[PDB]
């Protein structure tokens, strides 16, 4: 659209240079100086947003928020119908049974907690089932679903008899106090991609052997997996309590958001030191290019116009090298396992993920460009004082 | 009539940490349609004299005038308006821009004044063809010969159509065949509009120009 | 005595002006801008650690043991068992009282507790945090209550009146409790750091046995943990005072905000704040390649005298160490004179902008301390010489392949 | 007897980005007690020939020998051992160290060969007083005159008592009084031992010499 290009003088000074001269050498040292900082900085930025990618998708996207309990013990379903449970933010209800149990077999021991459901309803939290049918959950055979990682340390495959025991929620015998021993066979295993221990078993709600057949409470799901503080002190009926929430899992939702604010805002001194290499690159062109300033001072050049030549030339050197750090940052996007060979230290688990965000490019290119406009002031002022009488004719 | 009036420009500064008497009491007067060809020597301060008349340094002894505009009233930004419009500067110390092309170098004084881009390109084309260099317009001055890039610097000061062209020895860096041809290009400017040119001389190569040859050896007539 | 092995290093870059000296000014203050932040920025994180264990973790207790609606009658066998347990200071009681205050259109949880005044100098620092010169008014029998600072400016409970607060106690029925008038005059006021100034009140032992309406006993026994800086093995052994069931309540649970982010910031500063020294080492490369173009005839003199090829490369190695030592020496001096008097600096620039920022509403403290330790100063001087050795390897190899036949020698 | 035998000296490189035969087949011989005075013009081939005989570069045409040791059997580190033991280099434009004093400039080859530091400072004092410059020991070469900074460079190569002193026309910025007086000092080196020296001549200063006043026009020896 025929833009008024007034930066044509500074673009030719940084393009038409030789290779054997010493002025082209220091410009390369500066270019690879910013590229080191920007790239090593976007590598930390990629692995910090990768922790947000791994969380709330398959690690923190299957945990519940709040459960319903009572004070008199269990809950009678015929007095609390489905038309009376109306809360703010809830969308689905399901009965559930609680109680801490312990595994008492002839091989090893394990501690876990059951999860009572019905074959008519399906849980929307953990749909990852390794050939587990939600319909085949009849309580007449006393079946249970065992996790994959709990069955590996126990060494029991599907189709075997495993005895369970509960210390607390057993049969309240009027004469004594006996432990509830129930034969809960495993006919199928499942894996829910749990980096947590994950010792949850799946039982049926029709089990009149734990306590008193009634249930303990209902499930209250919520479509806000980040915070529950906006819907905590709401209207609640009589006979309901408040339980724990997302405050005890991995990283506590604190070690990523605080570290990103410390690396993005407080750690902005990388480009402040890297701007001094631009002053070295723009400070050597007043010695090998003394004659061109003498030509641009005698034919009617104002002192205001000569300040706008080295400022754009100092900003043109800050663009190249900073965009190379964004180009090398995209090179590590497809690097998942090949970038880290075996030098002994491996650190298995969820150590180094990758996540490229498009909104993190403008925040890292604006700080690397605006700090070069205020830095190029001392080489821009000392070149205007060079009169064409003592240096060159 | 009168363009520049030198009134005792004694340049007294630390020329190499010593006070020299090379530029002492220089005072002459150039006309408008006519001019002056100062015959000097190598070391008398011919290049030093044209720097003081153009407005590059201050002598702190006297003051000159330019059609009723003295240099005491001209600031640093006001001298840039005088050097760009009505002052031509021809030099001889390889004063070209090798980064730009030969077309942009002639158009460079017009690019400072920020005129219409149609009249910048057309004025540089007719000035390059006056010295016979329109076929080398889009060419770098680094690959040009010595008898070709010198004529670009001569045509670099005639695009603004000045009144006093302080030429610092334009003849001597090129051959004998093109020395006579560029004498008419300075002579045709007297016929169209009357552009004066104060040329310095130390090998007596401007002896046949006019009658006014003042021998100012070390500022002494 | 000194050790002068080769004297071709101190008198090699001796300059008196020009273009080589212009790079050495920017290379000095360029690396000094890095070291200045690693001193005044790490002293603020080291100052946050000493303000917690000495000021915050001094008046707060560690572990409490409660019961589910049962008075702790067996306080004699629980007292004798804890006498020979390692990591104790004293045996202080701890009673709880819920509260609902409706006065002056305010809703705050007033938490009260009882601490024996005979054992108070070896558990916390009570007499050092006092306003009056005479602190001899904290005895029993006179029924003298004391309040904090957070409630005095809004609830008109300043020293001079008779503060009577309606408090709910334990009862067999679950209804609205009695509004008994507390006829306890106030005399004296404590002072905290703006965190425990609205839920901190002290009651006498002979006076607290008439407001609970349960019995002449204590419902909870507290304990003091003398082991500091970690609580891992000091909470597993303190679980047999009660029955087989446990009641976990530690200081790391309710105060999990601090003492974790302080060590996490300095852990990144051992790998991210050292990154700016590697970028600053590129200025050492740019100032060592300019000492070759002007001293190109000087190396041609040494090559004609039969010099070793490893000797010429060893000149620019020690030349980059001396250029990196002078640029890093000024970064420590500028960091000491700021971190020692940081508190007049943060109050001088805040009053010039007009409205002040960084208040105390979500944050913990309005101002910041600065503790200068001799541990982080040595870590900067090690990496300033190791990273400069990798940066000076390339000018030491570029100036070695220069033949004297090309230069006019 | 013999010190250095020249066989097929054709230094062929891009001399001014062209390949010219200005230095082609320069075959001569220096003696242990005998010396040579090569006569030519200002900067024709004397600047290149003095660089090749000391061991600064390879001509890749032939080879030169030195007391039975040729340059083909010498590596990059082994060639530096011959330029310090029995070799000297004198130049024209006062090739000294300007950042150091005149006392430490004399003992510069003594500090490289790892000698005893007691005899290093004593040898620098007796060599400074040999040219009449012991009173200007602790001085800078930059603040000296024209005929003062030239005489200290001639007393720099002969400190470690070499066998061949490659002097590239020591006549120069020094005056006419110290022009012939320095020639008897270089004559004194060959009167007590077998230290020869190669001097080139442009404006016929070294015509009064021993026997070998031959001219060399572009690598071709004439009368």
């Amino acid at each position: 659209m025929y833009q008024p290009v007034a930066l044509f003088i500074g673009l030719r000074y940084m393009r038409g240079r030789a290779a054997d001269r010493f002025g082209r050498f220091v410009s390369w040292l500066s270019t690879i100086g910013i590229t080191l900082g920007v790239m090593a900085l976007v590598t930390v930025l990629s692995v910090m947003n990768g922790f947000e990618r791994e969380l709330q998708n398959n690690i923190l996207g299957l945990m519940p928020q709040a459960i319903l309990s009572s004070e008199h013990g269990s809950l009678n379903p015929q007095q609390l119908p489905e038309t009376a449970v109306k809360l703010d933010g809830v969308n689905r209800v399901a009965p559930i049974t609680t109680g801490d149990v312990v595994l008492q077999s002839a091989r090893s021991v394990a501690v876990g907690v059951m999860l009572g459901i019905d074959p008519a309803q399906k849980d929307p939290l953990t749909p990852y089932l390794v050939n587990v049918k939600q319909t085949d959950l009849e309580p007449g055979k006393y079946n249970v679903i065992l996790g994959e990682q709990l069955a590996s340390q126990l060494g029991v495959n599907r189709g075997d008899q495993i005895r369970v025991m509960v210390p607390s929620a057993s049969q309240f015998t009027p004469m004594g106090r006996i432990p509830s021993q129930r034969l809960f066979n495993v006919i199928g295993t499942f894996a829910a991609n749990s980096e947590v221990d994950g010792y949850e078993m799946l039982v049926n709600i029709e089990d009149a052997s734990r306590l008193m057949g009634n249930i303990t409470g209902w499930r209250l799901w919520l479509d806000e997996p980040l915070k529950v503080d906006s819907l905590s002190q709401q209207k609640l009926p009589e006979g309901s309590k408040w339980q724990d929430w997302r405050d005890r899992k991995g990283e506590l939702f604190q070690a990523v958001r605080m570290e990103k604010n410390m690396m993005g805002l407080l750690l902005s001194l990388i480009v402040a030191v890297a701007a001094f290499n631009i002053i070295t690159s723009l400070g050597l062109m007043v010695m090998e290019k003394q004659g061109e300033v003498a030509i641009l001072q005698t034919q009617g050049l104002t002192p205001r116009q000569i300040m706008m030549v080295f400022m754009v030339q100092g900003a043109s050197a800050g663009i190249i090298g900073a965009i190379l750090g964004a180009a090398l940052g995209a090179l590590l996007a497809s690097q998942l396992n090949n970038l880290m060979p075996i030098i002994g230290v491996l650190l298995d688990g969820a150590a180094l993920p990758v996540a490229i965000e498009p909104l993190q490019v403008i925040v890292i290119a604006l700080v690397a460009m605006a700090i070069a406009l205020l830095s190029t002031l001392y080489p821009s002022w000392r070149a205007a004082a060079t009169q064409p009488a003592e240096a060159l004719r | 009539k009168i363009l520049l009036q030198c009134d005792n420009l004694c340049k007294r500064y630390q020329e190499g940490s010593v006070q020299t008497d090379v530029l002492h009491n220089v005072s002459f007067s150039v006309g408008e349609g006519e001019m002056m060809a100062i015959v000097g020597s190598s070391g008398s301060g011919k290049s030093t004299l044209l720097h003081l008349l153009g407005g590059l340094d201050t002598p702190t002894s006297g003051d000159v005038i330019f059609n009723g505009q003295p240099m005491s009233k001209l600031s640093s930004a006001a001298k840039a308006e005088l050097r760009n419009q009505k002052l031509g500067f021809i030099y001889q110390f390889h004063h070209l821009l090798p980064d730009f092309t030969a077309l942009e170098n002639v158009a460079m004084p017009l690019l400072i004044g920020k005129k219409k881009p149609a009249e910048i390109n057309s004025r540089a084309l007719e000035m390059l063809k006056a010295v016979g260099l329109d076929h080398r317009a889009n060419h770098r001055p680094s690959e040009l010969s010595g008898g070709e890039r010198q004529r670009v610097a001569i045509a670099r000061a005639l695009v603004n159509n000045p009144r006093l062209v302080l030429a610092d020895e334009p003849t001597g860096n090129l051959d004998a065949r093109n020395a006579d041809s560029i004498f008419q290009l300075l002579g045709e400017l007297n016929r169209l509009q009357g552009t004066a040119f104060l040329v310095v001389t130390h090998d007596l190569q401007l002896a046949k120009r006019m009658s006014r040859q003042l021998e100012m050896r070390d500022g002494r007539l | 005595p000194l050790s002068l092995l080769i004297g071709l290093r101190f008198s090699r870059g001796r300059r008196r002006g020009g273009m080589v000296s212009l790079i050495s000014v920017i290379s000095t203050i360029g690396i000094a801008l890095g070291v200045a932040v690693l001193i005044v920025g790490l002293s603020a994180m080291n100052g946050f650690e000493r303000e917690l264990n000495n000021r915050i973790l001094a008046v707060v207790p560690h572990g409490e043991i409660e019961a589910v609606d049962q008075p702790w009658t067996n306080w004699q066998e629980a007292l004798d068992h804890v006498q020979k347990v390692p990591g104790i200071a004293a045996a202080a009681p701890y009673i709880n009282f819920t509260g609902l205050v409706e006065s002056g259109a305010n809703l705050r949880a007033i938490q009260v507790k009882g601490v024996n005044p005979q054992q108070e100098q070896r558990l916390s620092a009570l007499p050092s945090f006092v306003q009056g010169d005479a602190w001899r008014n904290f005895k029993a029998g006179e029924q003298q209550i004391i309040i904090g600072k957070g409630v005095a400016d809004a609830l008109k409970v300043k020293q001079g009146d008779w503060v009577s607060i309606m408090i709910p106690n334990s009862n067999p029925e679950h209804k609205l409790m009695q509004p008994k008038r507390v006829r306890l005059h106030v005399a004296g006021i404590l002072q905290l750091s703006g965190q425990l100034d609205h839920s901190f009140a002290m009651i006498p032992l002979a006076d607290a046995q008439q407001y609970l309406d349960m019995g002449s006993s204590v419902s909870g026994i507290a304990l003091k943990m003398t082991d500091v800086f970690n609580a891992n093995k000091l909470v597993r052994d303190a679980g047999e005072v009660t029955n087989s069931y446990v009641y976990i309540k530690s200081w790391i649970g309710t105060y999990g905000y601090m003492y974790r982010d302080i060590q996490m910031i300095r852990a990144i500063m051992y790998l991210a704040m050292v990154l700016v020294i590697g970028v600053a080492c590129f200025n050492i490369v740019s100032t060592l390649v300019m000492a070759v173009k002007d001293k190109s005839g000087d190396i041609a003199v040494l090559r004609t005298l039969g010099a070793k090829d490893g000797l010429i490369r060893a000149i620019f190695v020690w030349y980059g160490l001396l250029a990196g030592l002078f640029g890093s020496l000024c970064g420590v001096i500028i960091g000491v004179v700021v971190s020692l008097q940081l508190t007049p600096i943060i109050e001088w620039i805040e009053k010039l902008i007009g409205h002040q920022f960084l208040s105390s509403d979500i944050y913990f403290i309005d101002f910041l301390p600065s503790e200068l330790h001799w541990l982080d100063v040595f870590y900067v001087l090690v990496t300033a010489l190791l990273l400069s050795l990798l940066a000076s390897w390339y000018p030491a190899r570029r100036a070695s392949n220069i033949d004297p036949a090309r230069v006019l020698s």
Side-chain angles (χ1 to χ4, degrees), chain A, chain B, chain C:
Chain A
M1 58 284 289
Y2 206 90
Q3 315 99 358
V5 181
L7 71 159
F8 199 75
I9 311 177
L11 191 146
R12 202 57 81 96
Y13 286 158
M14 282 298 183
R15 189 176 184 269
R17 290 180 294 185
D20 56 354
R21 298 188 287 108
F22 52 90
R24 198 60 185 271
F25 195 61
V26 263
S27 85
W28 300 332
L29 267 0
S30 163
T31 302
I32 69 196
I34 355 248
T35 219
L36 188 108
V38 179
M39 186 236 344
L41 201 60
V42 80
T43 307
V44 170
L45 186 50
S46 279
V47 307
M48 281 308 172
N49 287 101
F51 292 142
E52 204 176 3
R53 197 263 308 274
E54 289 178 336
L55 260 66
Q56 73 262 11
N57 280 17
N58 54 3
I59 310 297
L60 265 298
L62 74 160
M63 307 305 176
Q65 279 82 13
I67 211 167
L68 184 45
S69 312
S70 315
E71 298 94 0
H72 47 267
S74 287
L75 192 148
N76 291 165
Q78 81 298 329
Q79 61 91 30
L80 190 61
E82 313 291 327
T83 187
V85 192
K86 294 179 299 300
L87 276 296
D88 193 17
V90 69
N91 56 329
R92 200 175 184 179
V93 288
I96 199 173
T97 305
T98 50
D100 195 0
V101 303
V102 59
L103 191 147
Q104 287 286 95
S105 171
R107 270 85 64 194
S108 295
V109 285
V111 194
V113 62
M114 78 288 287
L115 207 168
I117 43 169
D118 42 353
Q121 192 175 1
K122 189 250 289 180
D123 37 24
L125 290 201
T126 169
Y128 306 101
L129 299 180
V130 193
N131 304 331
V132 194
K133 184 185 300 301
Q134 286 283 338
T135 298
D136 192 69
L137 281 180
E138 296 89 55
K141 56 184 178 182
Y142 275 72
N143 61 328
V144 77
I145 310 298
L146 178 49
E148 198 265 331
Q149 47 183 358
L150 194 47
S152 45
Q153 62 214 270
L154 199 63
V156 183
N157 196 208
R158 57 173 68 179
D160 301 68
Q161 310 297 316
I162 302 94
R163 199 73 52 88
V164 80
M165 202 83 65
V166 49
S168 159
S170 184
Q171 294 96 13
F172 275 29
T173 319
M175 62 95 68
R177 178 62 179 83
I178 64 154
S180 197
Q181 36 182 356
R182 295 270 86 89
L183 191 59
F184 267 91
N185 62 327
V186 173
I187 50 180
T189 174
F190 84 111
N193 323 296
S194 316
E195 209 185 301
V196 71
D197 305 357
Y199 299 144
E200 197 95 13
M201 280 71 60
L202 272 304
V203 305
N204 204 77
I205 55 176
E206 271 300 317
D207 180 69
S209 72
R210 296 307 193 194
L211 75 162
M212 312 187 194
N214 47 1
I215 60 178
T216 79
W218 311 94
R219 275 295 306 122
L220 284 68
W221 284 292
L222 179 80
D223 48 350
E224 297 286 331
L226 192 146
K227 46 183 178 182
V228 303
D229 308 71
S230 189
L231 296 178
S232 302
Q233 282 85 12
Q234 59 182 359
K235 173 242 180 180
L236 75 161
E238 183 86 346
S240 316
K241 298 181 299 180
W242 189 253
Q243 292 297 320
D244 40 17
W245 67 289
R246 182 47 187 84
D247 268 334
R248 69 206 181 274
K249 288 289 184 177
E251 187 269 328
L252 307 180
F253 274 139
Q254 200 171 235
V256 172
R257 202 67 175 92
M258 189 270 295
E259 208 268 348
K260 196 170 60 181
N261 264 327
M262 192 267 288
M263 187 270 290
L265 297 177
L266 199 166
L267 202 78
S268 176
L269 75 158
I270 303 110
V271 295
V273 184
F276 289 122
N277 296 269
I278 302 169
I279 312 297
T280 316
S281 165
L282 267 299
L284 264 299
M285 45 92 79
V286 300
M287 177 62 179
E288 63 177 4
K289 195 173 71 68
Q290 285 154 325
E292 276 66 70
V293 189
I295 301 181
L296 218 61
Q297 213 73 27
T298 65
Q299 49 182 354
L301 274 302
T302 59
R304 195 55 185 178
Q305 205 268 350
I306 200 66
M307 299 293 186
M308 305 290 293
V309 181
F310 319 109
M311 194 262 301
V312 187
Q313 190 172 354
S316 298
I319 291 299
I320 176 67
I323 60 177
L324 297 182
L328 267 72
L331 176 63
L332 273 80
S334 199
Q335 301 290 117
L336 311 98
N337 285 171
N338 48 2
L339 78 160
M340 296 183 62
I342 299 104
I343 316 101
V345 194
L346 194 147
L347 297 179
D348 47 349
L352 276 297
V354 284
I356 294 297
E357 292 186 355
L359 77 160
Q360 298 287 335
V361 176
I362 319 290
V363 75
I364 212 65
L366 177 48
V367 57
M369 197 260 299
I371 212 163
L373 259 68
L374 55 96
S375 67
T376 60
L377 189 62
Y378 179 71
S380 181
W381 188 82
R382 71 172 287 107
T386 53
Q387 289 292 323
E390 84 295 332
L392 271 192
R393 275 93 178 176
Chain B
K1 194 187 287 185
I2 173 70
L3 267 172
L4 189 82
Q5 181 55 252
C6 319
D7 309 325
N8 311 332
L9 263 43
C10 275
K11 188 63 178 173
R12 302 279 92 88
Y13 81 110
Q14 293 185 346
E15 209 175 20
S17 189
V18 284
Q19 182 57 254
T20 61
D21 196 51
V22 55
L23 272 298
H24 180 268
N25 201 2
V26 287
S27 279
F28 44 85
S29 315
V30 285
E32 290 179 349
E34 54 263 9
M35 61 300 293
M36 287 182 46
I38 297 293
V39 44
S41 87
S42 159
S44 315
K46 308 187 305 303
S47 45
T48 306
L49 173 65
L50 313 173
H51 294 162
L52 268 301
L53 304 184
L56 311 178
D57 214 338
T58 42
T60 63
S61 314
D63 177 68
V64 298
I65 196 165
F66 214 92
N67 306 277
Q69 317 162 79
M71 285 204 171
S72 159
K73 309 304 171 273
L74 297 172
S75 45
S76 278
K79 291 200 213 162
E81 312 299 314
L82 271 298
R83 285 174 294 171
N84 195 25
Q85 301 293 319
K86 56 180 74 175
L87 266 175
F89 278 152
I90 302 171
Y91 281 106
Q92 61 175 337
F93 194 58
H94 310 73
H95 281 294
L96 279 78
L97 303 160
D99 303 309
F100 301 99
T101 183
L103 172 73
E104 286 159 347
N105 287 330
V106 186
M108 253 304 297
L110 311 162
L111 282 173
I112 296 154
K114 304 164 297 182
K115 308 186 189 58
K116 199 73 55 163
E119 72 188 40
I120 301 152
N121 188 29
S122 46
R123 277 210 58 89
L125 262 182
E126 57 99 15
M127 201 55 62
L128 272 162
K129 87 189 200 305
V131 287
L133 282 166
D134 50 351
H135 69 124
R136 306 303 287 265
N138 303 331
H139 275 259
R140 220 66 75 94
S142 51
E143 54 97 13
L144 289 179
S145 45
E148 283 175 351
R149 65 203 165 191
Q150 182 66 35
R151 309 186 78 176
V152 192
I154 300 178
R156 208 177 51 196
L158 318 171
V159 284
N160 46 0
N161 198 2
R163 306 279 95 91
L164 172 63
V165 180
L166 301 185
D168 200 339
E169 203 185 342
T171 41
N173 262 318
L174 54 90
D175 54 353
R177 291 309 301 265
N178 299 146
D180 311 279
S181 61
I182 63 171
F183 280 160
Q184 288 104 26
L185 271 294
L186 310 172
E188 288 179 354
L189 298 201
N190 298 323
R191 263 74 178 172
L192 273 83
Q193 81 269 13
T195 292
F197 51 99
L198 196 150
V199 52
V200 308
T201 298
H202 84 298
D203 308 327
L204 268 300
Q205 71 269 29
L206 272 295
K208 59 99 176 179
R209 190 198 68 76
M210 212 181 73
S211 159
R212 290 208 296 176
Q213 270 62 32
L214 283 67
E215 177 48 85
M216 276 197 172
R217 185 193 316 112
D218 295 327
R220 301 291 187 271
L221 195 138
Chain C
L2 55 95
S3 84
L4 187 61
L5 174 83
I6 299 297
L8 309 174
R9 288 99 183 260
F10 290 92
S11 300
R12 185 57 63 200
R14 278 296 170 265
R15 76 275 188 191
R16 294 301 297 268
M19 301 302 299
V20 188
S21 159
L22 191 146
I23 315 175
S24 282
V25 175
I26 320 174
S27 159
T28 298
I29 68 178
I31 200 177
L33 191 146
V35 190
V37 184
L38 271 73
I39 296 301
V40 313
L42 275 73
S43 301
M45 302 307 172
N46 291 330
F48 283 148
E49 190 171 347
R50 69 171 178 88
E51 282 284 335
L52 291 173
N53 65 325
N54 196 26
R55 186 177 184 179
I56 303 305
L57 260 71
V59 289
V60 286
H62 296 79
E64 313 308 309
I65 293 299
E66 57 98 20
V68 286
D69 196 28
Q70 181 254 358
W72 190 262
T73 319
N74 57 3
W75 76 294
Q76 292 298 352
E77 53 95 21
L79 178 62
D80 305 358
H81 187 268
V82 77
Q83 308 282 2
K84 287 321 294 172
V85 175
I88 67 181
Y94 189 80
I95 61 186
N96 261 26
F97 287 107
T98 189
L100 176 47
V101 187
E102 293 286 331
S103 174
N106 209 332
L107 191 44
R108 48 186 56 178
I110 304 298
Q111 168 64 39
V112 296
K113 47 176 295 176
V115 162
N116 189 33
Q118 212 299 310
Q119 304 288 331
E120 67 182 7
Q121 291 85 17
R122 53 188 60 89
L123 293 175
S124 87
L126 290 185
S128 55
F129 295 146
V130 78
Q131 303 180 186
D133 43 358
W135 69 288
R136 292 270 86 183
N137 47 1
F138 297 143
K139 258 75 64 175
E142 285 89 9
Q143 300 180 177
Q144 299 188 4
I145 211 77
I146 51 172
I147 67 153
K149 204 187 180 58
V151 297
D153 56 353
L155 303 178
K156 57 102 176 178
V157 285
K158 216 55 185 60
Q159 180 178 356
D161 48 19
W162 282 71
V163 194
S164 81
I165 175 65
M166 311 303 115
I167 191 154
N169 54 4
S170 168
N171 276 114
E173 56 265 356
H174 282 347
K175 273 176 298 181
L176 183 60
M177 308 314 181
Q178 59 269 15
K180 38 174 59 183
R181 313 291 300 190
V182 181
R183 291 286 100 187
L184 262 73
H185 68 280
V186 69
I189 176 167
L190 54 89
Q191 181 73 216
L192 261 296
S193 59
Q195 281 76 240
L196 276 297
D197 271 315
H198 55 269
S199 297
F200 190 25
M202 310 285 282
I203 47 180
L205 278 75
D207 198 72
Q209 304 292 327
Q210 286 88 6
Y211 292 93
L212 77 162
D213 302 338
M214 281 205 293
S216 158
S217 162
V218 56
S219 288
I221 299 192
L223 77 168
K224 186 64 177 181
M225 182 191 307
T226 63
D227 176 67
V228 304
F229 271 51
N230 67 317
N232 311 77
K233 55 188 182 302
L234 268 299
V235 294
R236 291 297 180 270
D237 47 353
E240 287 88 2
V241 188
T242 174
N243 301 91
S244 159
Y245 43 83
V246 298
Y247 295 109
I248 51 170
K249 200 71 64 179
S250 198
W251 61 273
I252 59 178
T254 175
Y255 294 141
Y257 182 72
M258 67 286 291
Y259 206 66
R260 177 164 171 87
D261 312 330
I262 307 299
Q263 207 73 28
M264 197 186 302
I265 281 175
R266 290 150 53 183
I268 310 298
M269 286 180 166
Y270 289 153
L271 54 96
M273 277 280 263
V274 75
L275 192 65
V276 303
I277 322 179
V279 184
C281 274
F282 284 99
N283 290 318
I284 323 178
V285 188
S286 298
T287 192
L288 258 68
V289 294
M290 216 63 55
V292 190
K293 60 103 176 179
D294 60 332
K295 300 297 179 59
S296 279
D298 188 75
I299 317 177
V301 174
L302 305 180
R303 289 186 184 273
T304 46
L305 298 180
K308 195 64 68 68
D309 210 351
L311 187 61
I312 313 295
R313 304 173 67 176
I315 292 177
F316 299 100
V317 165
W318 268 260
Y319 184 75
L321 292 179
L322 291 173
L325 191 146
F326 180 72
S328 180
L329 191 147
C330 318
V332 190
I333 306 299
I334 200 174
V336 161
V337 306
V338 170
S339 84
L340 283 180
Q341 38 181 350
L342 193 59
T343 38
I345 300 175
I346 208 66
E347 74 184 9
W348 184 81
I349 210 66
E350 200 73 29
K351 60 181 179 61
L352 296 178
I353 211 66
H355 44 74
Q356 56 178 357
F357 287 149
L358 269 300
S359 186
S360 198
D361 55 355
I362 311 295
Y363 305 100
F364 199 79
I365 182 177
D366 46 351
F367 73 101
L368 75 161
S370 158
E371 194 263 347
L372 177 60
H373 207 267
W374 302 102
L375 177 49
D376 285 290
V377 179
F378 191 76
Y379 279 156
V380 185
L381 298 181
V382 165
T383 182
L385 304 182
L386 294 179
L387 287 180
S388 68
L389 191 146
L390 191 146
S392 159
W393 181 260
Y394 195 78
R397 205 179 182 269
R398 187 175 178 87
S400 181
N401 56 86
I402 296 181
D403 50 340
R406 178 173 292 270
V407 70
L408 273 80
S409 185

